[model samples]
Target chain A: MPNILYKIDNQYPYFTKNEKKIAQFILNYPHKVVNMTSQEIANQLETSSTSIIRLSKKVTPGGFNELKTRLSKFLPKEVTQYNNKLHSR
Target chain B: MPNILYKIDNQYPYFTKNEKKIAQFILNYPHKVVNMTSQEIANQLETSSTSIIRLSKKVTPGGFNELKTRLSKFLPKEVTQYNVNKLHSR
Candidate 1:
């Protein structure tokens, strides 16, 4: 949660070149991915949707949505608190 | 060591499609790749030389030869013991 970037760095050796590219993008700009779909990441990274799904599975078995959730947890508490307040019904 | 196959199975999701093919072959036939070159594995798996090298790097930073050494350690004690005996300096 606090170290999604840290986990990805340690897990880099396990990822393919394309997956590594995606991992870096997610870690660098997680705000870009939290509510975005796998298709969105695929478009940005120039990789296929399935590729991000595959990479998501490898990084965490629950795949892209779960990766997004874990990533969102890394945000600053104040920012997350405000975002949660906004997103809440 | 005892669970080289175990590691491969758990790590299976991380491998490329081709790497998955190679991992299965190695877990099934450690003998074939233990002393064989990347070229040899490439030939057997009908994959390119570089693919195996890529896969080996993923499994261990030390690469193909290190993968071989770790795999050899997975052999049965008697077989590995015999192999070490044969390859021993004395």
Candidate 2:
């Protein structure tokens, strides 16, 4: 449990406005974050790759790549029985 | 990130029927699951604590408590800007 969200939240007070958006976006759509590149995500929020990189560094020492890796690890591959009724049904 | 869901989903096929239910419950409400005791969760699914322990062992080497620990590590303490707008407004 590396705690991506926890790290982000813990570092929230220190993030710039744009970094906050990136943080939230990652939290909002973790799946998307893991799949996309820093520039890709930067474009989505009209931010820059540098901003994402900086945010990554703030969240973890490993930077953007590490952030993505942590996200992929924390979240599920897809919807599971918990989030999907079909499986439970 | 220890990947609670990833491990659970990875081990999904090997889980018992009750263990599957436990797995889903954990994935569905990770925040709540972290705060709860194994017995408390057991009653919610009407499964025995044994089922949960087995699921824990199946998902990770530690067991149910470890699963919860991993989840807490992976998930946010509460909804932040990503999921909520209030913070973004700040």
Candidate 3:
């Protein structure tokens, strides 16, 4: 998969205000974002769920699930290993 | 994300026979495979849907859709453009 970090980095200029905000959040906290629901993310950002959804749409058509799936790949290995252990059950 | 090509390349040694076959097809025709349904791919390979699902599981927990999504990013720009045109019609 293409590096989602690269995608956001390159597309940063074109993003809407809310998208930029959410993208900054993602850039800052990709590892944290992976395990979060869009609602949880919205709550953290002081943004609405729809705004989060719109940010996801800006990233990929598969929406928040796709965003999380893509981001999951870029996590620190230990974190992903921990995640895998949690999910393996 | 890491390159899917690289993932399959490194994982080739550990794959089962059917997984190896499907991996070969993906490496050969990533651009084509992105556009194909799992059933269509199975038909082309003369394999079963279960094999395809198994192969997908090997590559990603999100399964076939995730595999396809990863592959889609590797397409030549023109092919992706064509895909965008098709998707944009909706």
Candidate 4:
């Protein structure tokens, strides 16, 4: 899916400040998120695992694993192609 | 425009709790919101004017009037058609 559609589909209107931060991070860096661990993401975003999990749960009705799975599917296809094209060029 | 498209176009993923609440209210009841005052909205949502304004600022980069105007433009076209369709169906 396109990053824009992914954002629109997953965005829940009711989110806490911390959750919003997490959402912004994910939306901004959808490609990088897969490589980063929860701890790394938390440190980078200056938040906690609890906040990340809360955000994952809020935006993705499927919970953390499912959210990750979906991201893995979409990001790999889009990011890899983009990355490959960028490198090839 | 469809309500779905309106939502997708305007929905900001990053929102404060209060802002998120307002977004949910607006998305869920786009047609109704065109008629309600901010005071009525605040009362129904159990929040304050400051929060409402903050939410308006946060979710809508265009501010309250612009947001309302955008809604006014899209909603009349979408909602009236929907209402008319429902009426015709019944």
Model 4 C-alpha lDDT per residue in residues A1-89, reported as the tens digit of each score: 34433563466356667777787777666545656667788999898877777767666676666556655543312124311111110
| B39-90: candidate 3 lDDT, tens digit per residue | 9899998999889988987788888888888777676544234332222110
- Worst 10-residue stretch by lDDT in candidate 3 chain A? A80-89
lDDT of 1 by residue, B1-90 (tens): 255555664455345568767886675567667778899889988999999998888878788887887776655444344342233110
RMSD, model 4, all Cα superposed? Answer: 16.1
Candidate 2's error at A12, in angstroms? 1.1
Backbone clashes in model 2, listed as residue pairs: A2-B1, A3-B73, A24-B82
TM-score of decoy 4: 0.41
lDDT for predicted candidate 1 compared with the true structure? 0.69
In candidate 4, which residue pairs clash?
none
Off by over 4 Å in 3: A1-89, B78-90
TM-score for each of the candidates: 0.42, 0.45, 0.43, 0.41
Which pairs, if any, clash in model 3? none
Going through the candidates in order, their DockQ values are: 0.02, 0.06, 0.02, 0.05
What is each candidate's fraction of native interface contacts (fnat)? Answer: 0.00, 0.09, 0.00, 0.00
- The global C-alpha lDDT for each of the candidates, from Candidate 1 onward, is 0.69, 0.70, 0.72, 0.58
Clashing pairs in 1: none
Write one digit per residue (lDDT tens) for candidate 3, span A1-89: 48777788799998878788899888766656777788999999899999998888778788888888777554422224211211110
Candidate 2 Cα misplacement greater than 4 A, ranges: A77-89, B1-90
Who is ahead in DockQ, 1 or 4?
4
Q: How well docked is model 4, in DockQ terms?
A: 0.05
